[PDB]
Design a protein around this ligand. Structure first.
Ligand SMILES: Cc1ccc(OCCN(C)C)cc1C(=O)N[C@H](C)c1cc(-c2cccs2)cc(-c2ccc(CN)s2)c1
Ligand SMILES: [Cl-]
Ligand SMILES: [Cl-]
Ligand SMILES: [Cl-]
Ligand SMILES: [Zn+2]
Ligand SMILES: [Zn+2]
Ligand SMILES: [Zn+2]
Ligand SMILES: [Zn+2]
Ligand SMILES: [Zn+2]
Ligand SMILES: [Zn+2]
Ligand SMILES: [Zn+2]
Ligand SMILES: [Zn+2]
Length: 312
C-alpha cells in the first residue's frame, strides 16, 4: 500500500492511500497520470508520492473543477487528459523569440494559434487557460495546447480552422470591454447603426484589409441595395480580419501577424506570418525572413486602442 495525491486542478491536492490489490479504477475511478489513463493499472511501487488526476466523485472536487476550468462537462477532463498525451510529446522550439510547435499530428493550426496568442493582449477567464498561457509564453506550452483541444472539442490529428479555434478561445476570454459600432447605409432602407460587443466586436469575415473595413464594404441588404458597412468606432486591443484564402500582399509594419493557408479545403497546411523589423515566416521550427510577402492569407491581426471614423 502506497500514498498518492488526487486532484482535479493540480492546485488543490488531496492525499489518499491506495492498496496494491485493487486498481486505480476501483478506488479513485477514472484516474490519469500525466496524461496516461491508469484506470486499469494497479498501483506500482514507483507511484508513491506522485500526483494523480481523477474525475470529480463528490461535490467538493466538482467545485474545484469549475473554479479552474469553467465547465461542468464531465467529458472535459477525459478529452483534456487524452490531448495532453500527445501534446506532452511534441517539440516546442523557440522561433524568433516565440514559442512554436514542430509539425506533428496535423498541429499546423495549433502552432499558428499559439504563435498568434503570444502577440495579442488576451486575458482568459478559466484559470487553467491563463496559467497554461503564462507557462506557454515561457516555453512550456504542452498543457496549454492540450487545453485548447479540450475547450474547442477537437481531438489530436483532427483538422482545425485557426479562425474557429480563435473564436472558441475568445468566448473564454474577457472581451466585455470590447465594443464595435457599425453603420450600414442602405439606398432604400435608409441609415441603420448597430453595436457589437464581446467576441463579435473583434472578428469580421469578408475582408483582410482593416483600411477597407474602415472605408466600407459592400454587403447586400434585404431589399437588394448593397449597403456600405463601414466601421464607426472600435474600442478593442486588437481586431481579427478574416476572409477566405486569397492572394494578399503583406508589408512589414502594416499588421501584427497573419495566417497563411495553402492547399485544399480542410486538407491543407497553415503557416504563420509575423511582422517585426522585417517580415518573418514561421512553419513549425522553420523560419524565413523577407522584406515583402505575397501569398494566400486567411486571417490578418491588427493592433487597436480607441478609433473613431471621420465619415458622415
Ligand atoms: C484546415 C481546416 C480545418 C477545419 C475546417 O473546418 C471548417 C468547418 N467548420 C465550419 C466547422 C476548415 C479548414 C480550412 O480549410 N480552413 C481554411 C482557412 C479555409 C479554406 C477555404 C478554401 C476554399 C477553397 C479552397 S481552400 C475556405 C475557407 C472559408 C472560411 C469561411 C468561408 C465562407 N464561405 S470559406 C476556409
Ligand atoms: Cl463560465
Ligand atoms: Cl469561460
Ligand atoms: Cl498593426
Ligand atoms: Zn478540497
Ligand atoms: Zn467562464
Ligand atoms: Zn465554455
Ligand atoms: Zn501522436
Ligand atoms: Zn501520440
Ligand atoms: Zn435595404
Ligand atoms: Zn499541417
Ligand atoms: Zn513562407
Amino acid at each position: 500500500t502506497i500514498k498518492v495525491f488526487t486532484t482535479v486542478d493540480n492546485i488543490n491536492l488531496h492525499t489518499q492511500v491506495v492498496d496494491m490489490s485493487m486498481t486505480y479504477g476501483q478506488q479513485f475511478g477514472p484516474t490519469y497520470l500525466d496524461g496516461a489513463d491508469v484506470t486499469k493499472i494497479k498501483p506500482h511501487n514507483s507511484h508513491e508520492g506522485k500526483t494523480f488526476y481523477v474525475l470529480p466523485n463528490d461535490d467538493t472536487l466538482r467545485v474545484e473543477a469549475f473554479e479552474y476550468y469553467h465547465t461542468t462537462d464531465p467529458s472535459f477532463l477525459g478529452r483534456y487528459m487524452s490531448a495532453l498525451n500527445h501534446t506532452k510529446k511534441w517539440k516546442y522550439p523557440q522561433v524568433n523569440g516565440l514559442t512554436s510547435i514542430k509539425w506533428a499530428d496535423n498541429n499546423c493550426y495549433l502552432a499558428t494559434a499559439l504563435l498568434t496568442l503570444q502577440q495579442i493582449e488576451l486575458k482568459f477567464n478559466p484559470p487553467a487557460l491563463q496559467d497554461a498561457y503564462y507557462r506557454a509564453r515561457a516555453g512550456e506550452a504542452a498543457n496549454f495546447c492540450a487545453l485548447i483541444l479540450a475547450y474547442c472539442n477537437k481531438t489530436v490529428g483532427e483538422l482545425g480552422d485557426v479562425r474557429e479555434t480563435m473564436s472558441y478561445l475568445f468566448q473564454h476570454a474577457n472581451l466585455d470591454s470590447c465594443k464595435r459600432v457599425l453603420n450600414v447605409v442602405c439606398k432604400t432602407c435608409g441609415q441603420q447603426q448597430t453595436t457589437l460587443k464581446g467576441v463579435e466586436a473583434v472578428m469580421y469575415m469578408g475582408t483582410l484589409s482593416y483600411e477597407q473595413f474602415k472605408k466600407g464594404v459592400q454587403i447586400p441588404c434585404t431589399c437588394g441595395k448593397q449597403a456600405t458597412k463601414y466601421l464607426v468606432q472600435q474600442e478593442s486591443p486588437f481586431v481579427m480580419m478574416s476572409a477566405p484564402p486569397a492572394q494578399y500582399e503583406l508589408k512589414h509594419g502594416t499588421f501584427t501577424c497573419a495566417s497563411e493557408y495553402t492547399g485544399n479545403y480542410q486538407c491543407g497546411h497553415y503557416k504563420h506570418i509575423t511582422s517585426k523589423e522585417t517580415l518573418y515566416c514561421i512553419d513549425g521550427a522553420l523560419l524565413t525572413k523577407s522584406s515583402e510577402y505575397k501569398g494566400p492569407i486567411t486571417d490578418v491581426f491588427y493592433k487597436e486602442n480607441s478609433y473613431t471614423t471621420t465619415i458622415k
